[PDB]
Design a protein around this ligand. Structure first.
Ligand SMILES: FC(F)(F)c1ccc(Nc2n[nH]c(=S)s2)cc1
Ligand SMILES: FC(F)(F)c1ccc(Nc2n[nH]c(=S)s2)cc1
Length: 283
């Protein structure tokens, strides 16, 4: 079926939970043996969210190459993304090592450091220009260059220096600051505006390594971001845009990381975002 009318048909019939449970039943199951090794317990935020062995990002290190991060490679859309958990106190150096080694330009953050009165990820970037951060375990230095605070999101320019080689690179930090503590946003308008700002920066384009996207677990909000981006790109590429099937795209992405889209409300919100976004691209 088309999307917008499949949408009203699920709303009127109140069957979002049944649709979402079908997706969960059909999703891929692949091994995650490296994630479950005992030496990696303090590298995982949640015991039930792990990268598959076949698609995990490897750190260029001979001691321990493990990070909780997955490469999502979308062949028809010609887009790639790295989805990862929010960094932990003992993985902030690994996180920036990955950004460096994978040649990423942008980092997309969809959570606040504290939500619901608890810590959802480490304070992994500097908050003042004159107070830079050094990650001694991976030999990197990170400096805040500029910051632009808007009503729904903040954009930061960061400088990452590899201290072994003295090479430097500019990294863009795109921080969506207004996702509610409970549920999903009422309108997708600010989320779509944010997606378009990431796109306009070059961070999603083939001349750079894959964008790094995270929330707390790296599967819920993060899944919504890449699902919406890929569906809108396919609608631009194909002769028949109504052939794009959001449930099929989501199942394809779940071949590369488990659990993408965590609730039926996130599924409905993804439909809403793609539907509204398709009108702005053109109508
Ligand atoms: F690393 C980097 F790419 F993010 C970067 C570092 C430093 C500057 N310098 C200046 N901006 N405006 C000035 S006036 S001087 C610009 C960009
Ligand atoms: F147990 C568990 F695996 F099921 C699980 C429980 C809780 C979360 N919390 C969050 N995920 N994403 C956020 S943003 S907050 C994630 C996973």
């Amino acid at each position: 079926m088309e999307m917008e009318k499949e949408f009203e048909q699920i709303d009127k019939s109140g069957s979002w939970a049944a649709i979402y449970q079908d997706i969960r039943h059909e999703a891929s199951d692949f091994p995650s043996r490296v994630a479950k090794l005992p030496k990696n317990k303090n590298r995982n935020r949640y015991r039930d969210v792990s990268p598959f062995d076949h698609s995990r990002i490897k750190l260029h290190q001979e001691d321990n190459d493990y990070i909780n991060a997955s490469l999502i490679k979308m062949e028809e859309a010609q887009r790639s993304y790295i989805l990862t958990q929010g960094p932990l106190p003992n993985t902030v150096g690994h996180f920036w090592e990955m950004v460096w080694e994978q040649k990423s330009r942008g980092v997309v953050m969809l959570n606040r450091v504290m939500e619901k009165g608890s810590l959802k990820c480490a304070q992994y970037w500097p908050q003042k220009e004159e107070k830079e951060m050094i990650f001694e375990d991976t030999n990197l230095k990170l400096t805040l260059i500029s910051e632009d605070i808007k009503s729904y999101y903040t954009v930061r320019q960061l400088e990452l220096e590899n201290l072994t080689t003295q090479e430097t690179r500019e990294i863009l930090h795109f921080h969506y600051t207004t996702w509610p503590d409970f549920g999903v946003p009422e309108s997708p308008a600010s989320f779509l505006n944010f997606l378009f700002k990431v796109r306009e920066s070059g961070s999603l384009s083939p001349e750079h390594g894959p964008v790094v996207v995270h929330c707390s677990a790296g599967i819920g909000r993060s899944g919504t971001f890449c699902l919406a981006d890929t569906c809108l790109l396919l609608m631009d590429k194909r002769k028949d845009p109504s052939s794009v099937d959001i449930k099929k795209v989501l199942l394809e992405m779940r071949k590369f990381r488990m659990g993408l889209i965590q609730t039926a409300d996130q599924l409905r919100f993804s439909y809403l975002a793609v539907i509204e976004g398709a009108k702005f691209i053109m109508g």
